[PDB]
Tab-separated table of C-alpha atoms in Angstrom:
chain	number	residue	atom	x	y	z
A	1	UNK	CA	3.439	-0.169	49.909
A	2	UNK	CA	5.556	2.932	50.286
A	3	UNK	CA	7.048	5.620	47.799
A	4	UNK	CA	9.289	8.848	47.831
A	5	UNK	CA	11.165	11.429	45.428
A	6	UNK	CA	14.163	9.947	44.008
A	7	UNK	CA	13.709	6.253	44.699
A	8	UNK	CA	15.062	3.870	42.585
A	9	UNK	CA	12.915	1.686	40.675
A	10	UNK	CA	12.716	-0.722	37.827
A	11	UNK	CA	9.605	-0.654	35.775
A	12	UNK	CA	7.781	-4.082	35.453
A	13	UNK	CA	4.526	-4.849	33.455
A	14	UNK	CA	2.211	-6.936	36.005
A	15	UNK	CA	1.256	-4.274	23.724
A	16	UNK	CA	0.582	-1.455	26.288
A	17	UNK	CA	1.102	0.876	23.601
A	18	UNK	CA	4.538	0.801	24.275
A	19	UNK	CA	7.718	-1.360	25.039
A	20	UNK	CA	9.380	0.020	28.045
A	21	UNK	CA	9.636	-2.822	29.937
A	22	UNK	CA	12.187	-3.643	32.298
A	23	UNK	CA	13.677	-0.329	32.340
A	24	UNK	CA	15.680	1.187	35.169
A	25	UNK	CA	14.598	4.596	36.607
A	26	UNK	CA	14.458	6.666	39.638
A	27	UNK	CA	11.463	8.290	40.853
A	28	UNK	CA	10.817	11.799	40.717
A	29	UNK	CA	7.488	12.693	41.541
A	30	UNK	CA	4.560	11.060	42.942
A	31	UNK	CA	0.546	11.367	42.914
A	32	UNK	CA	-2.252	8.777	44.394
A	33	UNK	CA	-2.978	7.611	40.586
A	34	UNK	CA	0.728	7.133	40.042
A	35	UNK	CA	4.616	7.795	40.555
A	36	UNK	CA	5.996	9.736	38.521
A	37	UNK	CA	9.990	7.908	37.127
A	38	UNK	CA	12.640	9.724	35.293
A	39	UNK	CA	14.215	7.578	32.025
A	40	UNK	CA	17.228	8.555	30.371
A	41	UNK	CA	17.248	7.804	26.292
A	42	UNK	CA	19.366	8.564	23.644
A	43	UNK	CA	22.282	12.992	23.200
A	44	UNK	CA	20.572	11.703	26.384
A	45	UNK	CA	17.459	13.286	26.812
A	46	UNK	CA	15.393	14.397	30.585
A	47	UNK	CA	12.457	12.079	29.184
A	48	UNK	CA	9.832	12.129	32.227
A	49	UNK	CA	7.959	9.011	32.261
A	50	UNK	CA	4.862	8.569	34.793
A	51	UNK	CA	3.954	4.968	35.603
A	52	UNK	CA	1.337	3.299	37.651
A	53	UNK	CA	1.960	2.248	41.136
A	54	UNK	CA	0.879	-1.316	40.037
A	55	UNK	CA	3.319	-1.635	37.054
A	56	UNK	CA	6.505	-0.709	39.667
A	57	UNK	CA	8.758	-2.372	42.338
A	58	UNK	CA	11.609	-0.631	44.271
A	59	UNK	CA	15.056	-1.472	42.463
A	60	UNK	CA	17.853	-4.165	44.680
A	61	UNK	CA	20.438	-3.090	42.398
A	62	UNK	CA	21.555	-0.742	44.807
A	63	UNK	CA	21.745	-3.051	47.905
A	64	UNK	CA	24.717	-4.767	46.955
A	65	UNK	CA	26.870	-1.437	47.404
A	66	UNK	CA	25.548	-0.653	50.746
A	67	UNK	CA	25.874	-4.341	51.305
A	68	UNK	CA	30.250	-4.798	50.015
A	69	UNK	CA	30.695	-1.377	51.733
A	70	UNK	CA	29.141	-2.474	55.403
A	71	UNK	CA	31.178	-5.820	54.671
A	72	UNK	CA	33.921	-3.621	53.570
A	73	UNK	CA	33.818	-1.651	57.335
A	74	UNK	CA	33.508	-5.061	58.785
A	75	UNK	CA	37.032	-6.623	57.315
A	76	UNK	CA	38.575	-3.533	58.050
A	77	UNK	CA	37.967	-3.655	61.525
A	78	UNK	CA	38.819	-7.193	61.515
A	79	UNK	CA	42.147	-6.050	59.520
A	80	UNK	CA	42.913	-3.672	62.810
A	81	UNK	CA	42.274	-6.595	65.512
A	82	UNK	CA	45.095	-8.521	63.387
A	83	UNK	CA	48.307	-7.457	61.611
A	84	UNK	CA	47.310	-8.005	57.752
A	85	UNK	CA	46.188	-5.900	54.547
A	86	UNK	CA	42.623	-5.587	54.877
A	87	UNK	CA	42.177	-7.441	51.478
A	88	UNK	CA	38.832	-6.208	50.703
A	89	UNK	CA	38.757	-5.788	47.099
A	90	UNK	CA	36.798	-7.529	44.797
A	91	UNK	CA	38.583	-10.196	42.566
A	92	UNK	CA	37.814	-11.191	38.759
A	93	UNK	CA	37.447	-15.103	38.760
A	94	UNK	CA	40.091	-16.849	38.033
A	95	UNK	CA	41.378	-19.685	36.545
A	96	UNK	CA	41.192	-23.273	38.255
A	97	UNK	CA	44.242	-24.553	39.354
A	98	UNK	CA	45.309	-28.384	38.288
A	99	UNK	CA	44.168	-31.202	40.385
A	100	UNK	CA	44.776	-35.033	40.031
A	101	UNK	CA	41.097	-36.474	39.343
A	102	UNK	CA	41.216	-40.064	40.391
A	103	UNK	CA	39.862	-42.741	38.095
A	104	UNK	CA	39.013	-45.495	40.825
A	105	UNK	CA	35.565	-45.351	41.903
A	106	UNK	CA	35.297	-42.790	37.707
A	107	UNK	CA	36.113	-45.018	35.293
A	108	UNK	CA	35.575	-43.415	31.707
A	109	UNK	CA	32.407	-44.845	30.119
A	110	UNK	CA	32.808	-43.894	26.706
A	111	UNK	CA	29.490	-43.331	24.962
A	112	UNK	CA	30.208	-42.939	21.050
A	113	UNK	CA	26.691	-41.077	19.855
A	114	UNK	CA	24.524	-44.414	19.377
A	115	UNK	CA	22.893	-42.137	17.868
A	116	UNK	CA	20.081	-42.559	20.412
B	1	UNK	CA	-52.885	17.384	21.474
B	2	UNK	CA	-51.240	19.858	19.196
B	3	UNK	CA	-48.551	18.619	16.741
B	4	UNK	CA	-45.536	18.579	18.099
B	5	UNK	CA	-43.970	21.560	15.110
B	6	UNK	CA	-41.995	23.097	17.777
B	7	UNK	CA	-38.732	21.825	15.834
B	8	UNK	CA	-35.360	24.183	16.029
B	9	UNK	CA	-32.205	23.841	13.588
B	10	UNK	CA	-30.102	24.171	17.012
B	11	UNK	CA	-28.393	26.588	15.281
B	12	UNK	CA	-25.998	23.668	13.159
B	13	UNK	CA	-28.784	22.189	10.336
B	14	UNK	CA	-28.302	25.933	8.804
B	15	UNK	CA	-24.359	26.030	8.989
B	16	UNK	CA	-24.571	21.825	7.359
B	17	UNK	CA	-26.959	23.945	4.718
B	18	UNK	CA	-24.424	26.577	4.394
B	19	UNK	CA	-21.479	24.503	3.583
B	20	UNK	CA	-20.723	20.896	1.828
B	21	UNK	CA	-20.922	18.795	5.544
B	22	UNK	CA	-22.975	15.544	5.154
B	23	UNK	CA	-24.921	13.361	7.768
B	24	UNK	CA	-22.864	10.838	9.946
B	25	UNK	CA	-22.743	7.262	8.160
B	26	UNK	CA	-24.392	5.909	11.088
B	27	UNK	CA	-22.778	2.849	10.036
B	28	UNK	CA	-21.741	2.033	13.379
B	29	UNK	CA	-19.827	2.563	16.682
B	30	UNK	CA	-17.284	-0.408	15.788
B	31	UNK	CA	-13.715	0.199	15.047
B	32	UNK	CA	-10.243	-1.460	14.521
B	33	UNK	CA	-8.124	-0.523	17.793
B	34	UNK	CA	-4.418	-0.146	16.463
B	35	UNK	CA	-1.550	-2.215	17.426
B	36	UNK	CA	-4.677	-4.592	18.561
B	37	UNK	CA	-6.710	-8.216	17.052
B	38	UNK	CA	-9.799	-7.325	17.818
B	39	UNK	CA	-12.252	-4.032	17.588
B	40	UNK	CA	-12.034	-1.663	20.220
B	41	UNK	CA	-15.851	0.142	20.128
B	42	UNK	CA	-15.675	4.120	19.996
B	43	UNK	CA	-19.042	4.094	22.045
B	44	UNK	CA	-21.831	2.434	23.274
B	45	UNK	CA	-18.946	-0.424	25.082
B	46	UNK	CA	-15.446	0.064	26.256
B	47	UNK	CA	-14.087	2.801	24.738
B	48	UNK	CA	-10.614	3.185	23.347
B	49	UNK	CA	-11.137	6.945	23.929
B	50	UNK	CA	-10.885	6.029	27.877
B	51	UNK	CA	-8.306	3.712	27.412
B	52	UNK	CA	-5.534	6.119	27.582
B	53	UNK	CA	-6.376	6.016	31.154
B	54	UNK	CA	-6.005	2.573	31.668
B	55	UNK	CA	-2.034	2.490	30.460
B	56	UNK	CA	0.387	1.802	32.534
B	57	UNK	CA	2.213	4.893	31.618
B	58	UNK	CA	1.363	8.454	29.917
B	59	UNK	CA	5.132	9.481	29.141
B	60	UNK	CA	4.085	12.585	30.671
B	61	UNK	CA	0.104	16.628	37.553
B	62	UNK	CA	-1.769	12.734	36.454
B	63	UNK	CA	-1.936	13.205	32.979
B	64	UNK	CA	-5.180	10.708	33.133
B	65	UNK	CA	-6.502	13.305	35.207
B	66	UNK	CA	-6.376	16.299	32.311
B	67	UNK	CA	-7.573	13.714	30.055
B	68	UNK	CA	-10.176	13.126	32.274
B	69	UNK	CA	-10.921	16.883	32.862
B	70	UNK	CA	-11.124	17.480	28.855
B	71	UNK	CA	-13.476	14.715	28.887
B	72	UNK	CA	-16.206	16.493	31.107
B	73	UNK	CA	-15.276	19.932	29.563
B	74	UNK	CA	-16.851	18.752	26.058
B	75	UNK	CA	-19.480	16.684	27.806
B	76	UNK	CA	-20.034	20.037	29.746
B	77	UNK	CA	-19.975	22.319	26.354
B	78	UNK	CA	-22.389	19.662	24.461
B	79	UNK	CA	-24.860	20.233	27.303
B	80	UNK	CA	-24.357	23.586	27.205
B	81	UNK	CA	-25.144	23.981	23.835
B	82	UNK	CA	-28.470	21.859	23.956
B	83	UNK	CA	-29.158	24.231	26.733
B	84	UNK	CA	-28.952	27.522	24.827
B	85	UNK	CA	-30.736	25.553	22.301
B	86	UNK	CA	-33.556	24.888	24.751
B	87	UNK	CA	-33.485	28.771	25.085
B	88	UNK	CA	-34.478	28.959	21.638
């Protein structure tokens, strides 16, 4: 494995006298015993927290922006080969629209707890 | 062979006279880790004293390495001591 100043990482156990577990952080020093990991706490405080290379992995959080915004590049391009608005934005889900479910080969077993 | 009545106070029997300090219990080198079921030994077995370097994290250079470093400075000042008692 690999490390440098100001990765991103999320710490990750592989009762330790503490509870951090989980937590997000980006690296900010590093040493062959360990790598060293900023972790903001509550005001928020520059809390310095050194970790062991084995307790660590690299964060993905981060992927997905570099991912939308290489996607994001790609529609646009595809937006200038074509007359329309680019129509990159992300969407909140929305509601399903109304569809005629057919009862044919679904008929409606009821089932009335037997209990069992 | 002569009788071996080359003893020495080592220069601490005579400050335990001078003041109220007792002999160790010598009860022995078991006891209760914290935060733990089941006794951590202080010596003679895996020590709790070392296991500060075995954490995953210090919350603070390697801080395992000081640790370490204060480790061999008293083991360093103990022998030194029985040294300059060995002078005497």
């Amino acid at each position: 494995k690999v490390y440098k100043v100001g990765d991103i990482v999320d710490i990750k156990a592989n009762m330790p006298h503490k509870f951090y577990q989980g937590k997000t952080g980006v690296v900010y020093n590093v040493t062959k015993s360990s790598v060293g990991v900023i972790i903001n706490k509550m005001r928020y405080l520059e809390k310095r927290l050194n970790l062991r290379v084995e307790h660590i992995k690299h964060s993905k959080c981060r992927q997905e922006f570099l991912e939308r915004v290489k996607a994001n590049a790609a529609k646009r391009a595809e937006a200038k080969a074509q007359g329309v608005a680019v129509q990159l934005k992300r969407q909140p889900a929305q509601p399903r629209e109304s569809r005629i479910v057919s009862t044919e080969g679904n008929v409606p077993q009821t089932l009335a707890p037997v209990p069992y | 062979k002569p009788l071996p009545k080359a003893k020495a106070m080592t220069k601490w029997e005579k400050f335990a006279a001078k003041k109220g300090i007792k002999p160790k219990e010598r009860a022995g080198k078991m006891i209760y880790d914290e935060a733990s079921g089941e006794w951590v030994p202080k010596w003679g077995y895996k020590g709790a004293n070392k296991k500060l370097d075995d954490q995953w994290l210090v919350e603070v250079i390697d801080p395992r390495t000081l640790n370490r470093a204060e480790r061999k400075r008293l083991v360093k000042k103990n022998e030194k001591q029985q040294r300059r008692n060995m002078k005497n």
